[PDB]
């Protein structure tokens, strides 16, 4: 994956775009980040992160889970020189190996995330 602008620092709340029953995803940490002093870990489309459900089914709340970012509002540059962004920040709950807990995704999925995660691409309806 090429570098893209990150727009979801720790503490962000994104929509849960799958059918697991969760409605919110609160970014706790981002995988692969060894930051610097006073720098918030940030995530962009196609990034796995540690999250917790703030609103949703009680069985999914009050516990630490993993999610993957599928859409972001922060515009990012593709290698063809285009600048693209979505209407909302969205993510999907996954396990530690990339398997998606749910089975369907509402809305499009970024090409950057689809290329990295085959299962998410499979469950996605549209790919943007």
């Amino acid at each position: 994956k090429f570098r893209i602008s990150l727009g979801l620092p720790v503490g962000a709340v994104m929509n849960c775009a799958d059918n697991t029953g969760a409605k919110n995803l609160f970014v706790i940490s981002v995988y692969g980040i060894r930051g610097r002093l006073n720098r918030l870990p940030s995530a962009g489309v196609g990034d796995m992160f540690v999250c917790s459900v703030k609103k949703g089914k009680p069985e999914l709340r009050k516990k630490v889970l993993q999610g993957v970012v599928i859409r972001q509002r922060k515009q990012f540059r593709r290698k063809d020189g285009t600048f693209i962004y979505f209407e909302d920040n969205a993510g999907v709950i996954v396990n530690n190996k990339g398997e998606m807990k749910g089975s369907a995704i509402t809305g499009p999925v970024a090409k950057e995330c689809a290329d990295l995660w085959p299962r998410i691409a499979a469950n996605a309806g549209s790919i943007a």
């Binding site: 090429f2 610097r36 002093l37 290698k79 063809d80 020189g81 290329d115």
Partner: protein, 395 residues
């Protein structure tokens, strides 16, 4: 007491002191190692940073996610009109370093080359090289010049040609030319001296110095910003909003002992206008002068057939029109527009794939860089927008 949490120091202490460059022209601090076997060639050139644009190219990078795909890349145009060889100088090794042995100037020096020796050329009598010129047509002067050539051939281990830019052909305000010593690589010392002598008073084109898809270095002075505080000069963390006496500062500038401020602490001062040497800038195109038939359409490619020159719609902002030969470098170049850039051949033996990658331009943007350009040519603009009240009243 140790600092609680570690953090790298702010800035590179090997680029200090952050002072204004001693000279406006970039100084070549090192030339490529000379290999006697290769053909005689120049190792540097002088150009002007005209402006930036972006291009579309097909990428040939096996294993990459953009293999056989089209990508958009930013490029910089450096106008490089041919230079004139005005002299020959050589250097002899001594226990304290190389030392210039002698300099032989061409018989006829251009007025703009001679201007460089002046601060008030217009007010002066323009007597520079007047007596030297006569030596070329004198019995004793010819003997002295021949002896100087013999000395260069016999004692020197490095040969440089003094070259100067030509300023009249640009049709701009400045007329004083820039002189520069460029080392000659290839062939023995005798061959180098003969080659320089033949090329005295002659023009050298940039395409004879640089090839396409070649990595070069840019030497010059960066863009100036004047006196600046630490937050901008060194990029230190801003202090809290509640700070009395200012927050764009460094809180602690040293410990009690040593009882002095160290040179490694961030302080306010000059920012920008620093001498720099950036290496590994890839050449994407060497375009010919737009005033010649070959360069009549130096802004088009093999796949974009529109007849257009490199100059964008409305000219290069704050620079002018690029009508001479130019080099299209990839990415950013130091200095502002109009800045004089010294191009140097790479000292490194390039081995990475990017060095040998072949660049294939598919399209070059020539839309106006003032505002948000919507058209690539004035003809296209007029064709799209139709006919205006001005044209109606012209009819």
């Amino acid at each position: 007491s140790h600092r609680k949490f570690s953090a790298p120091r702010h800035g590179h202490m090997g680029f200090t002191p952050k002072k204004r460059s001693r000279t406006y022209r970039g100084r070549i601090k090192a030339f490529p190692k000379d290999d006697k076997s290769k053909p005689i060639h120049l190792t540097a050139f002088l150009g002007y940073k005209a402006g930036m644009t972006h291009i579309v190219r097909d990428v040939d990078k096996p294993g990459s996610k953009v293999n056989k795909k089209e990508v958009v890349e930013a490029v910089t145009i450096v106008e490089t009109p041919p230079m004139v060889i005005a002299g020959v100088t050589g250097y002899v090794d001594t226990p304290q370093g190389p030392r210039a042995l002698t300099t032989i100037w061409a018989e006829h020096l251009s007025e703009e080359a001679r201007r460089r020796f002046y601060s008030n050329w217009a007010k002066s009598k323009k007597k520079a090289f007047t007596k030297y010129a006569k030596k070329w047509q004198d019995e004793d002067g010819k003997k002295l010049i021949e002896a100087d050539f013999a000395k260069l051939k016999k004692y020197c281990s490095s040969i440089r040609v003094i070259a100067h830019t030509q300023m009249k052909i640009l049709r701009r305000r400045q007329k004083k030319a820039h002189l520069v010593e460029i080392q000659v690589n290839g062939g023995t010392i005798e061959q180098k001296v003969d080659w320089a002598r033949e090329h005295l008073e002659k023009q050298v084109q940039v395409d004879t110095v640089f090839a396409q898809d070649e990595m070069i270095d840019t030497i010059g002075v960066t863009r100036g910003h004047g006196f600046k505080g630490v937050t901008s000069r060194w990029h230190t963390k801003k202090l809290p909003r509640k700070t009395h006496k200012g927050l764009r500062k460094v809180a602690c500038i040293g410990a009690w002992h040593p009882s002095r401020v160290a040179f490694t602490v961030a302080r306010a001062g000059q920012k920008g206008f620093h001498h720099r040497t950036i290496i590994n800038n890839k050449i994407y195109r060497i375009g010919k002068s737009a005033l010649t038939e070959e360069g009549k359409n130096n802004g088009s490619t093999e796949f974009d057939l529109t007849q257009k020159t490199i100059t964008p719609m409305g000219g290069f902002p704050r620079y002018g029109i690029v009508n001479q030969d130019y080099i299209m470098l990839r990415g950013a170049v130091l200095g502002p527009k109009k800045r004089l850039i010294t191009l140097r051949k790479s000292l490194i033996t390039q081995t990475k794939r990017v060095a040998h990658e072949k660049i294939n331009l598919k399209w070059i943007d020539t839309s106006s860089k003032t505002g948000h350009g919507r058209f690539q040519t004035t003809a296209e603009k007029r064709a799209f927008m139709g006919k205006l009240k001005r044209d109606f009243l012209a009819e």
